[PDB]
Symmetry: C2
Subunit: 385 residues, 2 copies
């Protein structure tokens, strides 16, 4: 009677919470300033329990005088990952970011065709506490990939690293082909733009930032000015009560090259064409609708193809070994229970991989436990665990 009333009621309020994921920078155009505006919120997890909310308000403006692409309403989707360098004695932060544009159904772009070296210099002052951060890294707009390492050059960071994340280069965001006309950030380079932000930390102080994002050579640079005020000495920020920390770096790299098998033209995505091409090489034959449905299945944002992040979130999961036996069937074409150096070579070739004969044998040897020169099921399984 009442137990059910609590249940149904709880499930409803909880459902809202599960729907209230995201996470998303909403971009709007601002004609008055030949630029864009944006706003979003960040949930910083608190060590012990709770969530520190930070409301962001963002305004961008071209530094140069040239023409600029003013976008229609859309949003940026981003994944962050913080970690530490075991060998670093300085107060530092390692960061991995994947930004992708969505929300829709030029010259400064060729600047972001390959890997671009990044430099970030931060000068901030929170409650009279002066500090400085500097970060080196690189960006890959093709995957919306972003990897940098920041170091505090003033000693100990007065605030939690997570709070500075949003402040420490949206020009590396990954814009889909059908939205490359809404990419304000790249159409502003090399001259670059100005990024201003007010960040309100609920029940605490606020940040005010002004940054210059431009090209100082072949290097993309981010010079930032920050000012924090009204922060409580016992608050989550000055009190360092927010959690800092999920895969391994090298771990993710594995999925990177796996992804590169499908993405054969290195444009950073997997189309239904590239997908079908691969499955067909592996002796499978999906229809056009199936291909589309497969992609649409993991393409949550709805851009069109399959992004590296999507590939990533899919491959991370766990549960259901059936996929392994299924993977074994793919290798074992004749289906007799063993994987031969030939069949293994055949799979490699199909996937479009250039492995020698010493290298293939090396792979066999790495899994061939009984030494029969083959790879049976019980070894294929253990080899993948």
């Amino acid at each position: 009677s009442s137990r059910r009333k609590w249940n149904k009621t709880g499930h409803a309020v909880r459902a809202i919470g599960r729907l209230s994921s995201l996470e998303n920078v909403y971009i709007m155009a601002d004609k008055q300033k030949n630029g864009i505006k944006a706003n979003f919120k960040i949930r910083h997890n608190i060590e012990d329990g709770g969530v520190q909310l930070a409301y962001h308000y963002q305004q961008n403006t071209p530094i140069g005088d040239g023409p600029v692409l003013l976008p229609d309403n859309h949003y940026l989707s981003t994944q962050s990952k913080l970690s530490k360098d075991p060998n670093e004695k300085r107060d530092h932060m390692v960061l991995l970011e994947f930004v992708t544009a969505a929300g829709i159904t030029s010259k400064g772009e060729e600047l972001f065709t390959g890997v671009v070296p990044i430099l970030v210099e931060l000068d901030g002052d929170v409650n009279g506490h002066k500090f400085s951060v500097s970060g080196e890294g690189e960006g890959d707009a093709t995957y919306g990939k972003l990897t940098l390492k920041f170091i505090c050059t003033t000693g100990k960071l007065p605030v939690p690293w997570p709070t500075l994340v949003t402040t420490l280069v949206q020009c590396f965001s990954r814009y889909p082909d059908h939205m490359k006309q809404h990419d304000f950030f790249k159409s502003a380079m090399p001259e670059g733009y100005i990024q201003e932000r007010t960040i309100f930390f609920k029940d605490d102080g606020n940040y005010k930032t002004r940054a210059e994002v431009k090209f100082e050579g072949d290097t993309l640079v981010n010079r930032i000015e920050l000012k924090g005020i009204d922060f409580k000495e016992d608050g989550n920020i000055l009190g360092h009560k927010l959690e800092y920390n999920q895969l391994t770096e090298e771990q993710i790299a594995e999925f990177k090259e796996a992804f590169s098998l499908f993405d054969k033209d290195g444009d950073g995505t997997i189309t239904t064409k590239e997908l079908g091409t691969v499955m067909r090489s592996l002796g499978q034959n999906p229809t056009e609708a199936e291909l589309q449905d497969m992609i649409n299945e993991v393409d949550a944002d709805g851009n069109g193809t399959i992004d590296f992040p999507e590939f990533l979130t899919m491959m991370a999961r766990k549960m259901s070994e059936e996929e392994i036996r299924e993977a074994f069937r793919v290798f074992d074409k004749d289906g007799n229970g063993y994987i031969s150096a030939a069949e293994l070579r055949h799979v490699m070739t199909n996937l479009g991989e250039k492995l020698t004969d010493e290298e293939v044998d090396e792979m066999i040897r790495e899994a061939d436990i009984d030494g029969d020169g083959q790879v049976n099921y019980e070894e294929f399984v253990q080899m993948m665990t």
Copy 2:
């Protein structure tokens, strides 16, 4: 070196497997017969390990002579659930199904406005083994809901129940507002239609079915003829090697009424309007883009709104208690650590629920452990576990 080669290679072939979910009846129009055609595959899990594949080929035709809606290419998405009645000594099967139409971006419809009583009669013969099945239940096209109990009237079922599932009423499928012009199944009633199928069980025999789906009164009836041949005595079908069995029935009902809180016009879906309306009652205020993004987040099929199945797959998950503390904040409006009968009444009312004062007090009493007439956090938590 080689360890990485195995990894990357494995992740790729496994990725295909993870993408190869679904599951989907692809419907095409057939003008030559004022009807539709379809084809799809079913993976029957094998007890011990493996997957029995069944390729379906389907052809539909109107029984009557009236006008018929011929649909454009689209698909049906379906969830099945088998279970047993502890009190049933006869060979039986309990079935819960959720069918929804998708793939796109009349008179016989009003027949499926409420709950419609279903009757199914099956007459089959596999490898000379004659049997009969009959099932009673009801359908709710509003949710694409389908619930029936089948009983073998010939004694012991010669084949696994799972294999007969697809054979044992796509007129209860849930068609989105923008696709109600592609609903062939309902536009055929009351006269109904004929459903023919050939089902190929890889490495085994095949079924041939012919069924009449029409209205025999207010009851929707499915009279089926089945014939199985070429099945191996030691195969998965005649050998009964396929697994039979995930939530509880009553369990799911809880989510049903929770869903009914959002779905306030009982059309079977949750629009951005209905969602925002609820969150606003609970003192929250999302923008239009956020609402859309929230729905688009769990609307995998891409119909538009939020279906009961989607609501279901979302609420089932597990992991991360944070949602509970968050749910507590929703109840505790003043935020002092306790939930009062008033605040509890306030939440009920907001969600659009008509609870008395004896009933609300009953809820408090069901969670008020220390007896202070309130509900603190440690009790709110334990109350939801």
